[PDB]
């Protein structure tokens, strides 16, 4: 039972260094909370089963790019927990990390064993549902903003339009509430990209990152989607774009 997306946004309050998507919050690890390596592949295969199955029902049983995205981000989230590279750990996702420790060992080399095991298993686990963690979350946040933009602008066009030689954004009570409601969205989206983009730089710079196809937080959305413009994205998120001036500015 995965709640419909855009019913919960990325929460930057729990960990203020990085914002966590709600999809990762609802990641089903329940069996991982209960040689051992082959014993661990089974417990993880159930969680990889339920998860990939529920996300499809969340997708209205449809086969489309949106579904393959939800499987992909959910797949990599598993690796970050199994490798110990997960930045989400809060509540019982800390418990999974501690469970895998006594299973994989805590030794200095044992951090290297986790990667090897997830290197072979990943080709399997992927089928059971049907790159650094921050790099993936910029791909997911990017797909959020592009499908959340036309809705907010649409809800605004209904309540604010027409010269009724001045705009409805002054003297019309319903429109002035609609404009502030837009402010909340574009504010959260701005404060989000603030936190998340720094986590991209604090990783790429502090850890050796061999992927040079993305040197900037902008480059992720540039390779993820087509009609993305670097300039326009800056204006929209700063509320200076040629829309939010024509709606919500009375002068």
């Amino acid at each position, epitope marked *: 039972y995965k709640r419909k997306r855009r019913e919960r946004d990325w929460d930057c309050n729990t960990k203020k260094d990085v914002c966590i998507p709600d999809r990762r919050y609802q990641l089903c690890m329940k069996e991982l909370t209960n040689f051992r390596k082959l014993y661990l592949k089974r417990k993880l295969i159930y969680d990889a089963a339920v998860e990939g199955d529920l996300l499809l029902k969340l997708n209205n049983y449809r086969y489309n790019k949106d579904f393959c995205k939800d499987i992909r981000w959910s797949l990599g989230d598993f690796g970050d927990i199994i490798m110990g590279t997960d930045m989400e750990g809060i509540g019982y996702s800390k418990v999974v990390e501690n469970n895998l420790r006594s299973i994989f060992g805590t030794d200095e080399k044992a951090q290297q064993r986790r990667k090897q095991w997830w290197n072979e298993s990943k080709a399997q686990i992927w089928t059971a549902m049907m790159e650094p963690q921050i790099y993936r979350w910029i791909r997911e946040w990017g797909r959020d903003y592009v499908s959340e933009l036309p809705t907010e602008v649409q809800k605004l066009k209904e*309540k604010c339009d027409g010269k009724i030689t001045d705009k409805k954004v002054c*003297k019309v*009570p*319903p429109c*002035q*509430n609609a404009c*502030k*409601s837009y402010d909340q969205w574009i504010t959260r989206k701005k404060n989000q990209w603030d936190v998340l983009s720094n986590k991209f730089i604090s990783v790429k710079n502090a850890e050796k990152v061999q992927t040079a196809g993305i040197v900037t937080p902008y480059d992720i959305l540039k390779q993820e989607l087509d009609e993305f413009n670097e300039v326009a994205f800056e204006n929209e998120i700063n509320k200076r774009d040629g829309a939010y001036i024509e709606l919500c500015v009375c002068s």
Partner: single-chain antibody, 228 residues
Framework: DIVITQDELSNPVTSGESVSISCRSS???????????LNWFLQRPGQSPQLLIY???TRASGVSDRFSGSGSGTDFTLEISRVEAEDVGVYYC?????????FGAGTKLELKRQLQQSGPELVKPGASVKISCKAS????????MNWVKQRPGKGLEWIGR????????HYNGKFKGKATLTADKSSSTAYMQLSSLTSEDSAVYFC????????????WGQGTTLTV
């Protein structure tokens, strides 16, 4: 200036006897989005206003399911089914089509058988006394603080509203010069300083938090008694 008027309840209402209060505007309360903007409140005999029904039929959370919001968009009606002794009081409507926000005269009812507002204030004529409204919620920066003027034995007069986030102000034309609407952010406190007092100004004043997302006035204060 939009006209609003309500009817009077002629006979004392027996408990459980149903009833319907009717509201009539002078203008279509529908909007460009095809939504009828309207509200229905109830003031307990001794309490602050409480929202019941908003956006025509849509019910307010916490309000009993037996209050109906029907309307044709210039003609609206509430409905009290199996009326309760708690509901005895005065009911008001609100219309959002354009400023000023106008609350109707109100309809009586018979029994047949939060926000921190500043304390009372008594000052000479021609004075100015700021009064506060303290909202503990962090929505104070994201909400609309509305101010309301309750004269003794009278309906509601909307003074204006201020949004602490961008510091916007909407002023009722009547009070255009008599109101000073500020807001404290750091302590999340709203302030209203009335200009040089006239004897007419003696009345209780209420603040109403409006969610920027719904837009109903759910949260009201204990009141502020002002005396000349």
């Amino acid at each position: 200036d939009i006209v609003i008027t309500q009817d009077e309840l002629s006979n004392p209402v027996t408990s459980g006897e149903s009833v319907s209060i009717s509201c009539r505007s002078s203008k279509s309360l529908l909007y460009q989005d095809g939504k009828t903007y309207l509200n229905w409140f109830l003031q307990r005999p001794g309490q602050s206003p409480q929202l019941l029904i908003y956006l025509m039929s849509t019910r307010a959370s916490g309000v009993s399911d037996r209050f109906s919001g029907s309307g044709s968009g210039t003609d609206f009606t509430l409905e009290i089914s199996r009326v309760e002794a708690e509901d005895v009081g005065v009911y008001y409507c609100q219309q959002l089509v354009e400023y000023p926000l106008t609350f109707g005269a109100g309809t009586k009812l018979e029994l047949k058988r939060q926000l921190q507002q500043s304390g009372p204030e008594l000052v000479k004529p021609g004075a100015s006394v700021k009064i506060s409204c303290k909202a503990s919620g962090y929505a104070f920066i994201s909400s609309w603080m509305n101010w309301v003027k309750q004269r003794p034995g009278k309906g509601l007069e909307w003074i204006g509203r201020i949004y602490p986030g961008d510091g916007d102000t909407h002023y009722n034309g009547k009070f255009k010069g008599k109101a000073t609407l500020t807001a404290d952010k750091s302590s999340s406190t709203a302030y209203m300083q009335l200009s040089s007092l006239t004897s007419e100004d003696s009345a209780v004043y209420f603040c109403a938090r409006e969610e920027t997302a719904t837009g109903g006035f759910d949260y009201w204060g204990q009141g502020t008694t002002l005396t000349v």
